């Protein structure tokens, strides 16, 4: 199980990207509770390049979809689209405690499906220049494989995802 | 605690 | 045409003890030639394993396995061997053919400490994108697989054969080109 937690993160994350919206808010860097507790910045690797901040990743996504001249895509073609084919999630620490309010420790035991550190793998395709619902009229097609380490967003769980779990580590590959 | 050693 | 993100080689940032190297050199050699020996070395009662999909020898294999007691199959330590037995025979390229491998790894905080002596332990995340030759002798099926495999490694339980163990092993079998 725990797919349900991963599903909500996955749906949020690739939707932001596909709507040209930022994903930086999903990383630990931008959660005050985690950072004042001393959490390090997210460890992000993009096709083998270590990327220092989530903000820089958003900028890179923007650059990837940028069109410069001489040629131009017909209207109605979308510069970049990510299609998720599959995702899978394992719990790698069911007793995650870092930056937890003590109350959350007390309220949810490791068997209770809340205080979960998760390893998430996502695979699918990247379409360049395709019509938004086409998988055939692309100019270029890549395979992509994303992996994440997700940690509990105490701020939200105290009170689906895109905010229920935060990204602590992220590796992106496309080829 | 770590068994992997420090990153370089 | 918009331009895809630049593609760089493997980004290997493991700790000084070079466990990612020792582990992966053993892993793919044994996966090809002595697969089940991996489990007592690195797998324990808590390890979890998944195989996912993104004719295919593996497809028919995981189908029949799942019926019995794009598609997903998740198992605990009790079934890992039995599943691995059913997965296709393989030959992977040597790891020193560096351009045939995309291996990214880093150490990360806040695993549990199985000794209970500390509140946290460092982990090692290893993600692999590679290819191999796959064969199924009976069905005369031979071809080239493209795959992803993500490992999470962490400190082993007291008494284990190595000081580290596999916590999580996620195999994604996408493309299969017959040949």
Numbering used by the authors:
A (entry chain B): 3 to 72, 76 to 164, 168 to 183
B (entry chain C): 30 to 37
C (entry chain A): 364 to 417, 422 to 436, 447 to 556
Study authors write:
The TREX-2 complex integrates mRNA nuclear export into the gene expression pathway and is based on a Sac3 scaffold to which Thp1, Sem1, Sus1, and Cdc31 bind. TREX-2 also binds the mRNA nuclear export factor, Mex67:Mtr2, through the Sac3 N-terminal region (Sac3N).
The complex with ctSac31−20 crystallized with P21 symmetry and the structure was determined to 1.8 Å resolution with Sac3 residues 15–20 (QVNNPF) clearly visible in the electron density, whereas the complex with ctSac320−40 crystallized with P212121 symmetry and the structure was determined to 1.85 Å with Sac3 residues 30–37 (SSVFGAPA) built into the model. Although the overall fold of the ctMex67 NTF2L domain or ctMtr2 was not altered by the binding of either ctSac3 peptide, a translation of the loop region of ∼3.0 Å prior to helix α1 of the NTF2L domain (residues 376–382, the pre-α1 loop) was observed for both peptides. However, in the ctSac3 peptides in the present study, a greater contribution was made by residues neighboring the bound Phe; as a result, this residue only contributed to 39% (ctSac31−20) and 35% (ctSac320−40) of the buried surface area.
